[PDB]
Amino acid sequence: KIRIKLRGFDHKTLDASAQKIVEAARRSGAQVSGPIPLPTRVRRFTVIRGPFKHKDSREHFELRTHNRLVDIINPNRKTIEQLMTLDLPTGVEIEIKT
Amino acid sequence: ARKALIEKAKRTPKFKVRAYTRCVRCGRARSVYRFFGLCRICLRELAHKGQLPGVRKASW
Amino acid sequence: PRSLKKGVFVDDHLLEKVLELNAKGEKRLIKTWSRRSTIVPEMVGHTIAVYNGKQHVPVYITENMVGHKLGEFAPTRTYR
Amino acid sequence: GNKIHPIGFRLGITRDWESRWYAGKKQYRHLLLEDQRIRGLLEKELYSAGLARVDIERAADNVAVTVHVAKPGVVIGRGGERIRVLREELAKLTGKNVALNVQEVQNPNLSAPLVAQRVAEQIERRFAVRRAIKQAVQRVMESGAKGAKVIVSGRIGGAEQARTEWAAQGRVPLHTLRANIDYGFALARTTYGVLGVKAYIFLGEV
Amino acid sequence: EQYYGTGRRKEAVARVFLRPGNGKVTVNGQDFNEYFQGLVRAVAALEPLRAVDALGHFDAYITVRGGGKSGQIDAIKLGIARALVQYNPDYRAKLKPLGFLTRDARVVERKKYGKHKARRAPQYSKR
Amino acid sequence: ARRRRAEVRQLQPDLVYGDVLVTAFINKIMRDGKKNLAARIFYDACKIIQEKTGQEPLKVFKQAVENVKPRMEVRSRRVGGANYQVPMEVSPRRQQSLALRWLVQAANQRPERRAAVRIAHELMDAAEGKGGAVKKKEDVERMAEANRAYAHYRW
Amino acid sequence: ARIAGVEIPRNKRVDVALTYIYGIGKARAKEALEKTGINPATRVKDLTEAEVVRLREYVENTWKLEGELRAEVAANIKRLMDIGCYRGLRHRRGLPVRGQRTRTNARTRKGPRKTVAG
Amino acid sequence: GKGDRRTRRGKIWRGTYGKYRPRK
RNA sequence: CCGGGCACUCUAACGGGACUGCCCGCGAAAGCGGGAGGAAGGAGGGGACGACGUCUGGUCAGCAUGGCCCUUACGGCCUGGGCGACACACGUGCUACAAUGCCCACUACAAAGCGAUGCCACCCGGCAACGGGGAGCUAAUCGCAAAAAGGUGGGCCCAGUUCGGAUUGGGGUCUGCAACCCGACCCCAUGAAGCCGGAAUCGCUAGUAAUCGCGGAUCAGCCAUGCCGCGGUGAAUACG
Numbered sequence A: 001k002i003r004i005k006l007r008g009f010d011h012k013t014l015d016a017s018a019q020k021i022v023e024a025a026r027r028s029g030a031q032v033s034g035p036i037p038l039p040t041r042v043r044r045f046t047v048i049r050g051p052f053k054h055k056d057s058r059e060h061f062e063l064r065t066h067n068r069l070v071d072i073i074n075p076n077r078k079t080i081e082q083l084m085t086l087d088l089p090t091g092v093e094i095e096i097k098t
Numbered sequence B: 001a002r003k004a005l006i007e008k009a010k011r012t013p014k015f016k017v018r019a020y021t022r023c024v025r026c027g028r029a030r031s032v033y034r035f036f037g038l039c040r041i042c043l044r045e046l047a048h049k050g051q052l053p054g055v056r057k058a059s060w
Numbered sequence C: 001p002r003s004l005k006k007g008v009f010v011d012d013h014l015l016e017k018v019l020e021l022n023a024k025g026e027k028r029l030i031k032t033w034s035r036r037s038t039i040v041p042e043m044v045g046h047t048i049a050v051y052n053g054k055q056h057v058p059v060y061i062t063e064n065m066v067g068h069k070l071g072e073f074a075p076t077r078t079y080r
Numbered sequence D: 001g002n003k004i005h006p007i008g009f010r011l012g013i014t015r016d017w018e019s020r021w022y023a024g025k026k027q028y029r030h031l032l033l034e035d036q037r038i039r040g041l042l043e044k045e046l047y048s049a050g051l052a053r054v055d056i057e058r059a060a061d062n063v064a065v066t067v068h069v070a071k072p073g074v075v076i077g078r079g080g081e082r083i084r085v086l087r088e089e090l091a092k093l094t095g096k097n098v099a100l101n102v103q104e105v106q107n108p109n110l111s112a113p114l115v116a117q118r119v120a121e122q123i124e125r126r127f128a129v130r131r132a133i134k135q136a137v138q139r140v141m142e143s144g145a146k147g148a149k150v151i152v153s154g155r156i157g158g159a160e161q162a163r164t165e166w167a168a169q170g171r172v173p174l175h176t177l178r179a180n181i182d183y184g185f186a187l188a189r190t191t192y193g194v195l196g197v198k199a200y201i202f203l204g205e206v
Numbered sequence E: 001e002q003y004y005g006t007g008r009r010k011e012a013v014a015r016v017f018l019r020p021g022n023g024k025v026t027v028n029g030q031d032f033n034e035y036f037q038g039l040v041r042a043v044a045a046l047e048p049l050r051a052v053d054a055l056g057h058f059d060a061y062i063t064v065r066g067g068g069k070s071g072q073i074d075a076i077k078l079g080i081a082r083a084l085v086q087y088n089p090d091y092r093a094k095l096k097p098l099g100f101l102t103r104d105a106r107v108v109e110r111k112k113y114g115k116h117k118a119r120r121a122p123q124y125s126k127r
Numbered sequence F: 001a002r003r004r005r006a007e008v009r010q011l012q013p014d015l016v017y018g019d020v021l022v023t024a025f026i027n028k029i030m031r032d033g034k035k036n037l038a039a040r041i042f043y044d045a046c047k048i049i050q051e052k053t054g055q056e057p058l059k060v061f062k063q064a065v066e067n068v069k070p071r072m073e074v075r076s077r078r079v080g081g082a083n084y085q086v087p088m089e090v091s092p093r094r095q096q097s098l099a100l101r102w103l104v105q106a107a108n109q110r111p112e113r114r115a116a117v118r119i120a121h122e123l124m125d126a127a128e129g130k131g132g133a134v135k136k137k138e139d140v141e142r143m144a145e146a147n148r149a150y151a152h153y154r155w
Numbered sequence G: 001a002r003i004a005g006v007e008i009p010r011n012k013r014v015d016v017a018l019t020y021i022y023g024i025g026k027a028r029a030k031e032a033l034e035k036t037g038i039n040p041a042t043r044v045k046d047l048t049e050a051e052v053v054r055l056r057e058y059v060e061n062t063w064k065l066e067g068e069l070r071a072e073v074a075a076n077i078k079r080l081m082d083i084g085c086y087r088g089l090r091h092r093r094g095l096p097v098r099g100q101r102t103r104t105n106a107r108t109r110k111g112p113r114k115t116v117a118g
Numbered sequence H: 001g002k003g004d005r006r007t008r009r010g011k012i013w014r015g016t017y018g019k020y021r022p023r024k
Numbered sequence I: 001c002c003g004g005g006c007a008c009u010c011u012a013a014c015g016g017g018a019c020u021g022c023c024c025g026c027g028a029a030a031g032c033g034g035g036a037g038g039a040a041g042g043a044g045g046g047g048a049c050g051a052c053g054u055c056u057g058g059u060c061a062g063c064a065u066g067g068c069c070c071u072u073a074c075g076g077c078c079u080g081g082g083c084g085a086c087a088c089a090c091g092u093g094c095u096a097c098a099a100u101g102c103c104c105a106c107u108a109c110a111a112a113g114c115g116a117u118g119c120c121a122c123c124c125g126g127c128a129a130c131g132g133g134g135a136g137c138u139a140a141u142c143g144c145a146a147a148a149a150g151g152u153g154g155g156c157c158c159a160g161u162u163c164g165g166a167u168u169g170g171g172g173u174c175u176g177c178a179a180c181c182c183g184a185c186c187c188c189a190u191g192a193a194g195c196c197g198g199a200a201u202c203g204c205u206a207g208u209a210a211u212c213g214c215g216g217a218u219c220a221g222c223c224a225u226g227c228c229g230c231g232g233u234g235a236a237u238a239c240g
């Protein structure tokens, strides 16, 4: 019963970190319930191409935020041994709650 | 983007309504996105240069 | 079909000035750049020079002028 | 009115962001301004060393600034005091108190920013522009570099009329997403005007 | 016992469950004619059964959500077709010429900049 | 259509009579994309056809459409610098299209209050050989064959 | 019948009929027929003499009506003009008063279109 | 139509609420 | 809703899948026509992407920048006015001119987004704008929220009107130091032109046109009927 909310801009990085957490918790904890997709938050930005009038191009971009919901059950006292300091990813934020 | 207008940054704008937002990079006044703090032109430039994490070209 | 709010706003620039004039008499033309201020009854009888952007027009205030702004009697634009 | 930026066109595949960190909506602009100031002060001091890229990564009040320079001996200084002064200015500008890393660039003639900088220096020294572009493209192609292209903007040779010298050879498939084309841009500030130098270097297919 | 079909049309799903019964249909707890009957094309959702002329051999329990009720009707058609095919594969040769098992891939085309609705160019006069 | 031949669209059959012509008439009645409203109009018009005529409304509908179909029309042609009204035959698809369009347009010209009554009365009058649509057919077949002298400009 | 002036609506719903009173719209007609306890669906020719007297007694003196209403609006505009107000100037020139543009339409305040040379 | 302040479609078009378009 | 479980729907990562592979006809071939199978074919549909160059095209007013010019003012601060001026002309749009409509009541389905000096369920006051109180929500779990056309019932009965809401009078709300010039919104009253538009002219080949509503960026507020997106219903026609 520990809420884990991962958030990031790269899906490969979040997925790799989630699989790392799952493999580090399987050997030391109980049957992990795996990650949940937690649908993406997309924020778009439409910006005129040219610095002057040229109104009908607009070349819009997007920024997506992906989330993960590992949510390990049975927070065994042996699980945090392989956890809480073992991480490759950099551009990934982690949320932990009880 | 006149230099004197870069006085926009002001702890004492004398009023809340007078406080507007400018582009921190080029000093623009219009089309200033609040999320990035830049204008639209600097947004496009720094997005092309890859200096904005997670910003990608949209297509659907 | 106009209104502002409860607690009518009047610029305290000339608010103290008109009552200071009433405290001693009926002094002549007063010059005010605050055309946003609302007319109050204690101004009736005086003559306020309202700045219309270029000059000061000698707006004399009567009884039936209470409630309006000074700019309503100081036109800013010239036409024909 | 065409030819969008290739680096931004490939930020998804075969090109990664220089700044790679997550930040909320209430903090994205501040960290972005901070990274912009970092790159600004970095490109003003390390130009003599030939820096090609400045990668910025953030986890929690710690920034792993990795500067890719063709000549690390300049950024290191005597015994390592230059990097000490640079980290001092870094901690003075940003109160984050972070570290710094240096990466040597093997064969700087394969990084388009440094190629464009070399061409811009040659243009600023009053060198033959056509020969400069030809020699630069030749130096790039003669070491790997399955494709190369260098473009110089108007006022070539200080002329009154603006021109554009092409001088390219190899393969530059700009419309190919998997092209992996390194792109660089430099400026030449002359007594008569401003010269824009663009450099495309094509390497790898998948 | 029970045969399932999914179906989909214009961003709408309709879980179709076929259980042999009288021939009455339930949709989201409501009757087939209390959701419909105000939509003329509703009968089309029962066209697969008429394709095999059963019309009384299968009660239907359908759970529909997504798009509008017309796309919902067509998704119900496709779901009934899929469940009826799962019942007996020999029905495919009877349902393929009618195309009831064909997925309708017509989707609302995305709106584009410079135009009004994804294709409507803004009117110009040139004078 | 320049490159291809622009093959004709195949309409879904009617939900009542199973006729694609009925569906095409529905579509010609349709307005702003309101299919259910046009279906209401036409099916209530069919309910008006009965209790006014012992015949099934499908037969009356088909016979009216057949009575509206024009045999020859007249198209313009620029020859020698001038513009002439050349008569020429009509393909069956254009016959059906013009028939349905004329039926709808002539029905909405009627003084009847609601749309179902208009469509029903127009269908009946066209089935018995009168109304605005038959007048349009007669005017077209008058203009055509009134300029027989241009028959050699057929093309 | 004759209610709240010399005006007589006839042969339609009583609320729609009262809409033909100058000081009365649909809201005031609904309010009057609601406080007077009169079915708004009935026609005018289907009204009881007592119901007409009731509606008359209420509407005649509960709001300001045709004569006094037009006189009061004219007096308001005349007062705006006599005080030299900006709105009085706009009424004086036959121009929009409520802050609309004049380089273009807002023709409904300027009357017909007096095209000139150019 | 959509331009009458005192109608349902008027409030919906202008995106407001009032006497002629309550919030249940 | 609880127990309960990942079958289905959905969610987001990966992968499969279509290549004229197969069949018939034609053809030197490429390929074309048709068919089978298939969710889909003959570029499946839509984006992103737009060559050497042209227009001495546009912008030194986003920025950079050569030269020239101003430096007790061509720089700088502030108050107010102005950019909203109206005899007129044009472009782009919005709303309409109604019965395939309008209005009232009840009722049923969507996608994409936004949300902590924020979104505000809900309760009370108020005709209402809104105010007071106050739950939840770092948000697939709470809120914006109602989707609208639609359906069902009822009213209107062809009249400038229960069409259409311009204009104006009066009374208010909210943002904001401050709504005179010059805000939006609410309520009462007012009720304009307008009966489908001359010469001329525009968009669109399928989920397109048409029509219906929803969100967002900038923004304290807003003149947004704009712009960028989202889904609902859904045509006509192409001889050439």
Ligand SMILES: [K+]
Pocket: I056
């Ligand atoms: K040029």
Ligand SMILES: [Mg+2]
Pocket: A057
């Ligand atoms: Mg384009």
Ligand SMILES: [Mg+2]
Pocket: B001, B002, B003
């Ligand atoms: Mg400047």
Ligand SMILES: [Mg+2]
Pocket: B017, B018, B019, B020
């Ligand atoms: Mg502001």
Ligand SMILES: [Mg+2]
Pocket: C005, C006, C007
């Ligand atoms: Mg008050």
Ligand SMILES: [Mg+2]
Pocket: E108, E117
């Ligand atoms: Mg659409």
Ligand SMILES: [Mg+2]
Pocket: F102, F105, F106, F132, F136
């Ligand atoms: Mg006709």
Ligand SMILES: [Mg+2]
Pocket: G019, G020, G021, G022, G023, G024, G025
């Ligand atoms: Mg009246």
Ligand SMILES: [Mg+2]
Pocket: H001, H004, H007
């Ligand atoms: Mg109305």
Ligand SMILES: [Mg+2]
Pocket: I006
């Ligand atoms: Mg599963």
Ligand SMILES: [Mg+2]
Pocket: none
């Ligand atoms: Mg499955």
Ligand SMILES: [Mg+2]
Pocket: D175, I049
């Ligand atoms: Mg391509």
Ligand SMILES: [Mg+2]
Pocket: none
């Ligand atoms: Mg020029």
Ligand SMILES: [Mg+2]
Pocket: none
């Ligand atoms: Mg010019």
Ligand SMILES: [Mg+2]
Pocket: none
């Ligand atoms: Mg302007």
Ligand SMILES: [Mg+2]
Pocket: G099, G100, G101, G102, I084
């Ligand atoms: Mg104005």
